[PDB]
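Structural prep section.
Before we set up the soaks we want a predicted structure of the protein with magnesium ion in place, mainly to decide which crystallisation condition to try first. Input record follows.
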Amino acid sequence: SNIIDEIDKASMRDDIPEFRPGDSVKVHVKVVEGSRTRVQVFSGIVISRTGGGVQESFTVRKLSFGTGVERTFPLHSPIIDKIEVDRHGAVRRAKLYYLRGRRGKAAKIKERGS
Amino acid sequence: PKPTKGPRLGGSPAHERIILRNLASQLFEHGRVVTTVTKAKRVRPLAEKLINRAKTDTVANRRFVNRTITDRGIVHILFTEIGPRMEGRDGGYTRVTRIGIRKGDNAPMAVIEVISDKVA
Amino acid sequence: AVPKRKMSRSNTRHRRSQWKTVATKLVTCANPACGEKHLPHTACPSCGGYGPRGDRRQVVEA
Amino acid sequence: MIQQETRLKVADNTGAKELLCIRVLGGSKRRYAYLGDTIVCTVKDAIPGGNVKKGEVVKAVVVRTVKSHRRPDGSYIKFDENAAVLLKGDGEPRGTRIFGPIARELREKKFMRIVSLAPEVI
Amino acid sequence: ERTVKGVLGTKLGMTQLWDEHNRLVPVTVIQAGPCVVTQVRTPETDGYSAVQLGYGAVKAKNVTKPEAGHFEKAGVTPRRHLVELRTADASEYTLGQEIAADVFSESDFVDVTGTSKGKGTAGVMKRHGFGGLRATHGVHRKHRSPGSIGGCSTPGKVIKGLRMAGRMGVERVTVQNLQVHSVDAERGIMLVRGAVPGPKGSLLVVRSAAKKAA
RNA sequence: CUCGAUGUCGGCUCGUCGCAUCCUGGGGCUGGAGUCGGUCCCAAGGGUUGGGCUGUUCGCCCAUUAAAGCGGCACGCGAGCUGGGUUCAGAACGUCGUGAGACAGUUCGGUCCCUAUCCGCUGCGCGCGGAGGAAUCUUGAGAAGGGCUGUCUUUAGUACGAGAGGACCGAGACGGACUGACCUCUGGUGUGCCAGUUGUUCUGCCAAGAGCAUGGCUGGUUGGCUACGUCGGGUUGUGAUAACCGCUGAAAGCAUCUAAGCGGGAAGCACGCUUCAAGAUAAGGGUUCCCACAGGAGUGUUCCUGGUAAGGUCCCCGAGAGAUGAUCGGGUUGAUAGGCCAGACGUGGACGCAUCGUAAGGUGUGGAGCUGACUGGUACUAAUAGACCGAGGACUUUCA
RNA sequence: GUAGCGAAAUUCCUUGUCGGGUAAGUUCCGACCUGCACGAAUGGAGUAACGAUUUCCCUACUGUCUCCACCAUGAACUCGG
RNA sequence: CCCUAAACCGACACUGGUGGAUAGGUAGAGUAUACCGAGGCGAUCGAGUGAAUCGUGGUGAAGGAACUCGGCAAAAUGCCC
RNA sequence: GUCCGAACCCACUUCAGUUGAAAAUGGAGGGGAUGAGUUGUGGAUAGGGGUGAAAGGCCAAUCAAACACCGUGAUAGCUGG
Ligand SMILES: [Mg+2]
Ligand SMILES: [Mg+2]
Ligand SMILES: [Mg+2]
Ligand SMILES: [Mg+2]
Ligand SMILES: [Mg+2]
Ligand SMILES: [Mg+2]
Ligand SMILES: [Mg+2]
Ligand SMILES: [Mg+2]
Ligand SMILES: [Mg+2]
Ligand SMILES: [Mg+2]
Ligand SMILES: [Mg+2]
Ligand SMILES: [Mg+2]
Ligand SMILES: [Mg+2]
Ligand SMILES: [Mg+2]
Ligand SMILES: [Mg+2]
Ligand SMILES: [Mg+2]
Ligand SMILES: [Mg+2]
Ligand SMILES: [Mg+2]
Ligand SMILES: [Mg+2]
Ligand SMILES: [Mg+2]
Ligand SMILES: [Mg+2]
Ligand SMILES: [Mg+2]
Ligand SMILES: [Mg+2]
Ligand SMILES: [Mg+2]
Ligand SMILES: [Mg+2]
Ligand SMILES: [Mg+2]
Ligand SMILES: [Mg+2]
Ligand SMILES: [Mg+2]
Ligand SMILES: [Mg+2]
Ligand SMILES: [Mg+2]
Ligand SMILES: [Mg+2]
Ligand SMILES: [Mg+2]
Ligand SMILES: [Mg+2]
Ligand SMILES: [Mg+2]
Ligand SMILES: [Mg+2]
Ligand SMILES: [Mg+2]
Ligand SMILES: [Mg+2]
Ligand SMILES: [Mg+2]
Ligand SMILES: [Mg+2]
Ligand SMILES: [Mg+2]
Ligand SMILES: [Mg+2]
Ligand SMILES: [Mg+2]
Ligand SMILES: [Mg+2]
Ligand SMILES: [Mg+2]
Ligand SMILES: [Mg+2]
Ligand SMILES: [Mg+2]
Ligand SMILES: [Mg+2]
Ligand SMILES: [Mg+2]
Ligand SMILES: [Mg+2]
Ligand SMILES: [Mg+2]
Ligand SMILES: [Mg+2]
Ligand SMILES: [Mg+2]
Ligand SMILES: [Mg+2]
Ligand SMILES: [Mg+2]
Ligand SMILES: [Mg+2]
Ligand SMILES: [Mg+2]
Ligand SMILES: [Mg+2]
Ligand SMILES: [Mg+2]
Ligand SMILES: [Mg+2]
Ligand SMILES: [Mg+2]
Ligand SMILES: [Mg+2]
Ligand SMILES: [Mg+2]
Ligand SMILES: [Mg+2]
Ligand SMILES: [Mg+2]
Ligand SMILES: [Mg+2]
Ligand SMILES: [Mg+2]
Ligand SMILES: [Mg+2]
Ligand SMILES: [Mg+2]
Ligand SMILES: [Mg+2]
Ligand SMILES: [Mg+2]
Ligand SMILES: [Mg+2]
Ligand SMILES: [Mg+2]
Ligand SMILES: [Mg+2]
Ligand SMILES: [Mg+2]
Ligand SMILES: [Mg+2]
Ligand SMILES: [Zn+2]
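Run finished without errors. Recording the tokens verbatim:
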């Protein structure tokens, strides 16, 4: 019902930038270190956006030290300080799962308006 | 529209798709059709989707309707007679009425028919 | 498996008596000019019409 | 998820290149090992020049699972290869270096040395 | 013998929240609507202490004369549902009294009772977790069989209570120690941390946690 | 006992029971510094792993675990599965026999079936009864389920001990296994949805599409179902006890846990928690509704017919329900479903047009078009119209 | 009883012993000879190639399995014959 | 008149067996396979319904023989240069 | 008596069937597929005999001696009535 949605509006945020899978994104994830806290930047390619209200989440793929790391973030999670969009990709798919098995020049995304 | 949940007509989902499309085409061809209860009640949503799409006449809409039906003569009927007949109707372009049963196999039979009178 | 013994008359009849059918109910046609019996929520086979005394839309050409 | 007969790669420089999970420590009947779980392994393949021989039974901690890992904040982490890090029987690495990214779940008060040597903790 | 607070509601669905430790918590949304005390049961007249609550929106043409008379004696408008709450403080309840979701605070533990979702006639492998037979290696038309169901000439019988196929679901299930996340009484909404039995729209009984807490 | 047939090993599945207890609980004696141990009692509530070898049982071994118990049930369980072993016809080896052949010697190969009548058992209905007919909410005689456990932190380096070592009794945190519900999250599915694409046929052709090839094949994917998913659960306790520890105390001037009596005392017993439950024919209880109908026989009215009240069913639209019955909701005084309108999800840029490119194609118009289940509206379509059942002051007796 | 072969389709004892392979190998692969009861045209020992033969191992691969879920269908199920 | 069959051999108007001739198009090496032609058929009980279950197909996270007497079945591999 | 592979011939594995569609088959794979190949028509060999790339195989759907009739109402210390 819309009662569920109006309850969700209390948890949803407003400062989310507009982006699509295929875009290069830096997510400023807050990391708890005992007494300390820090902001660690996860830079990568958005490969999926599973939508729907406060349930919206997006997946970012990074290539670090010869291994791929995928992180899935709820788009309205309070652990995300902010989201930066670097490149706007030019893809043809909603889910970029094919990038999992691609590395090198075959794994790079065209920029929007090219 | 919504899938059929249970087992499909004609012993196969592909055959059910064919059956529903042909049955909608025959409904549009003849105005009314006696086609047992389950087939009529399963073809009603598709037929009303098609009629609603045909309520507004554009070339793109005619091609989209011709994706189904596939008989351009029936497409012409739908876009010329059935379509303008439902200018003021907000849905409910067809009605189903039970007739009885078939002697051979006791199939409950019903006639589905496009609305004939103008709403205005 | 196979029936070990011939079932008694009492038990056979107890089971067989439950193989039955209910009578079809039938309703009087709302059309005053017809007044015949038809199935509920079904067009009258005689007049070929459906609906209350007012509406009365033709359904079957019979 | 790492179960018996799962083969893992090594994030250490002990010379071992591939481990076979013989058991998942943590209780009887336990099925799977996740990020930060300790397993008993055998060394299927090792570098000829190294301090670990093939067929040696060792203990390792699982890092870099392929399946997924949920976190209490609702996020998930996923890698592209099942990895593991050998141990000296007291919670400390046998090797002197760690390779590739390491999960944050290793920094649950437990594997401080591994997290310190981690090139990247995600 | 135990004093229990209670309220009736409807399962509206689920969503998710983030608590103050930034933890994702699944919450069920219960329209813990206004309930009215239709009847109070006393040891003198009934033999036990309990409070009958109403709750529910009902059409005036769907309430029969006996129900209408019951509600008229209660002095309240007719409600769709009627459920009792076995409380030892039933007396403190007056006939026609108003009960709202604010009967529960922001961190009370509760027990939620509802009728589970139905599954129809379920097999042994589904309704009892039976491990069947293998898929290959000569298994002959018994891949989901229940296996043996007894011994031999002794006891030459099938013991009572053996788990076999049958209809699963649609039964009273109580899930305990769910911590209420939030209560908004002005619209009768309760957010309860967890998953409660039953499909969306079912009736739910939210009572104080019998075992208090963990 | 069975030869007008009682199918014979091990595993799989499903259990159930005994206790001669493997772990967990309790206690004596030793002890034993502690830490641990080992032994005689109690105790069957729950739990009691995954693999290598062999057809194996057995057994050995690897890695764990609180522990990897022993047995019964036709050495439980082939109208449940397995056929590897055994015990058919083929063949070979060794040994034996002149030979046909033989071998609890070995080796390779090697048919089974069953639509469940009765009891049994898991589920689900119909009927009748519950002394008037109904509607709702219930009590619980009784029944079932559930009952596992680890590691770490702290008490405390305290007690103990010469040191090294290292507690009991309590407190807290986090797990394994098991399990209930559940779909917000993650994963899987997807005969719907969107998209791409090969071959081919077709819609006259272009354009745009359609059929078939496993949904032709691929890329995704809401709803639903689900676990690999996330929430919860075991308990905190009470009573009477087991072994055992006692108090007072004789018989027997003492003593003695006992003969009178009282107290402690375990995961066991009975409760506590969850669930079913008045066919509990002992058929319960509360609250509410309907009412003294009609016509015959009659032999105290009796009893049989008939129309109703309260109420219910049939029929129709459905799903939160479902094999079918059933259940729940709706039935025009109506949002029950479909359609329609809008939204969300999903796909990812439709047709057309403009422009660029020789062309395949690119860009723009434009998060476009399409679109199911989810959400909100809206009587446009179908829930027409009607029947049928259903008390009568409700048997009798005594009380008040 | 020679050449050769030998715990072998032959070895009872027996899972012989040692060695290899496995984290763990009554099978296997190479050896030993103590051949219960090998052995030279009922041929001995080998052998490239061949085998829907028997046996062991590695790799790839997977619902074989941990642990099953979901989809569509022919029966099953309801109605008529 | 039937004749790779409902008419023959199988007790049947039986998913079996039955010799020879003709045998087009596109993709293809092909008489394989896919979709079509000439031509012929819609198959000789139906209508429904998301039960368990059996048969027949399909897909699958992570793992990859831990299954099992045994990799049984399936998956992978597959064509041309 | 080459290789891959349809027709054709075969019958290795598996599943289904097992009161079957079928008194031996069907689905999925599998072997041969210029040869000791396969197949049509007609013919020859006959029961202590046939024929057998040999399994006591086959000789009109049960062959360690076919089928039919006859001796014949065989005989049975056995079972039944
Ligand atoms: Mg989206
Ligand atoms: Mg569906
Ligand atoms: Mg059918
Ligand atoms: Mg198709
Ligand atoms: Mg009976
Ligand atoms: Mg299974
Ligand atoms: Mg099978
Ligand atoms: Mg008996
Ligand atoms: Mg007998
Ligand atoms: Mg005992
Ligand atoms: Mg036990
Ligand atoms: Mg007991
Ligand atoms: Mg042994
Ligand atoms: Mg036992
Ligand atoms: Mg036995
Ligand atoms: Mg049996
Ligand atoms: Mg055998
Ligand atoms: Mg046997
Ligand atoms: Mg030899
Ligand atoms: Mg001799
Ligand atoms: Mg054998
Ligand atoms: Mg059966
Ligand atoms: Mg009771
Ligand atoms: Mg009883
Ligand atoms: Mg959802
Ligand atoms: Mg998904
Ligand atoms: Mg065609
Ligand atoms: Mg394919
Ligand atoms: Mg979903
Ligand atoms: Mg004394
Ligand atoms: Mg004393
Ligand atoms: Mg375009
Ligand atoms: Mg040996
Ligand atoms: Mg031996
Ligand atoms: Mg050895
Ligand atoms: Mg010689
Ligand atoms: Mg010789
Ligand atoms: Mg010899
Ligand atoms: Mg020879
Ligand atoms: Mg030789
Ligand atoms: Mg050789
Ligand atoms: Mg061979
Ligand atoms: Mg291997
Ligand atoms: Mg069927
Ligand atoms: Mg029938
Ligand atoms: Mg022909
Ligand atoms: Mg035929
Ligand atoms: Mg014939
Ligand atoms: Mg060609
Ligand atoms: Mg062909
Ligand atoms: Mg033609
Ligand atoms: Mg023909
Ligand atoms: Mg026929
Ligand atoms: Mg059905
Ligand atoms: Mg497959
Ligand atoms: Mg998929
Ligand atoms: Mg998989
Ligand atoms: Mg995978
Ligand atoms: Mg692999
Ligand atoms: Mg194995
Ligand atoms: Mg095993
Ligand atoms: Mg195979
Ligand atoms: Mg394959
Ligand atoms: Mg050749
Ligand atoms: Mg032929
Ligand atoms: Mg054979
Ligand atoms: Mg079989
Ligand atoms: Mg060859
Ligand atoms: Mg002749
Ligand atoms: Mg012989
Ligand atoms: Mg013969
Ligand atoms: Mg003779
Ligand atoms: Mg004579
Ligand atoms: Mg005689
Ligand atoms: Mg006899
Ligand atoms: Zn009429």
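Observations: The CA atoms of residues 100 and 119 of chain D lie 6 Å apart.
Flagged for discussion at group meeting.
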